[PDB]
Amino acid sequence: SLAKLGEMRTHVGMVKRYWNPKMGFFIEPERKHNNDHFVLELQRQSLQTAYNYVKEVAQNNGQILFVGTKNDYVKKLVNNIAKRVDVAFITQRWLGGTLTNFKTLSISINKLNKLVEKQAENAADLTKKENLMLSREIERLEKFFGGVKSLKRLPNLLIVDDPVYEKNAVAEANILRIPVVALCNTNTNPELVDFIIPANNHQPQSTCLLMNLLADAVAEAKAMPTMFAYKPDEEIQIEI
């Protein structure tokens, strides 16, 4: 079934003694490992609620964004998934001043498209210096803000592995009343984020299957074939 407990054998504990007491309702008593373990039933209910919520909102084609900026493994998985399916994603950090205003994205994407069509119509007819420089800025800008060019409206929901790890972006989402899902570890505030998902990221399985499940939810919400919604096959991936 959805959000099954089969994969939840290594799903608890991310950090030790750096915790928020305001997150205690979503967790189970500690062990000698000092890892902040998670209740697997309340987490399952919250995951189901978030799944049906995102399914409903993205069936009407609500704008959804992806922000995964982990070191190499979760980042690579997000890159592969978001390249496979035509979805919006920003796999790099946030410098601010983008989510706040659509006017700060309209001109940016206009210039991006202008540079793309220029490079498509340029064949080193000018000096090699200008062509190489322009390609360099295109690659540099697209490496952060290049995975999203299909949006014409405001975002409606965000997905973040750890809000404190991207607090600036959270601030950019705090101005709007839009909801947001987050894999809060132990040190978050359940008032700046609407959906509370008690989960860890110290283990590959937890975060990878969470991200894949969200990706399949969004894909199926866009009238696409189902990939992982009730399958009991636990894909095996290790952090590397």
Partner: peptide
């Protein structure tokens, strides 16, 4: 914001 509008 339970419903989408």
């Amino acid at each position: 914001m339970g419903n989408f509008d």
